[PDB]
């Protein structure tokens, strides 16, 4: 038979992507983004709404304070920075 036998494409993607607001675009190639949750309480039923301060990598510095942006998770790119700013749709 052929010397070379081929491989597969392992359908890949769907890295977690969500809409956040840039809030601490302060450090070089670095932004901090926040998210919203709306979850029914396990016991009572009072839907609580909380947040989360993810750290994202901006190689370009496009974002800024209070911008409605989107983020996809990457490979771990540093100690607490695991997000890629893509599909920006609001500033300020």
């Amino acid at each position: 038979g052929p010397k070379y036998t081929p491989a597969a494409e392992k359908p890949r993607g769907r890295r977690k992507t969500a809409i956040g607001y840039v809030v601490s675009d302060k450090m070089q190639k670095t932004i901090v983004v926040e998210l919203e949750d709306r979850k029914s309480h396990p016991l009572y039923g009072k839907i609580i709404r909380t947040t989360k301060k993810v750290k994202a990598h901006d190689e370009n510095g496009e974002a800024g304070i209070g911008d409605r942006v989107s983020l996809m998770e990457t490979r771990p790119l540093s100690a607490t920075k695991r997000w890629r700013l893509v599909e920006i749709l609001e500033k300020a």
Binding site: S40, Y44, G45, K46, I47
Partner: protein
Amino acid sequence: MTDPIADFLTRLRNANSAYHDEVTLPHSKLKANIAEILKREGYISDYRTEDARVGKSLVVQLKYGPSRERSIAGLRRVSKPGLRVYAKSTNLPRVLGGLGVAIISTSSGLLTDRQAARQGVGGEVLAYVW
């Protein structure tokens, strides 16, 4: 002031209980449809909306039979603020074991227990009257 629909139901309860044969109300579409379905199933006599303070006003006549007896048995908002309530297609509660009727604000609009059971969508129930 926090809750308008609870005050709607409280006024219905007091006015019917205190033997009044009518009640007047501001006309926000929510309570409008609540009283609309109420007369639809016949726990009240008839509702009519006219013009008032900047909005409009709905006036509700309570159905009383041969004596001063109310077809309404009672009213209680369930999906209140701070405890808003959602329900699904399967476990659609049966009011008074199924005797009564309820309000369930479906994604397709507004439906009761039996209607939503015949159809099968859920998401938000409200007060029930029996």
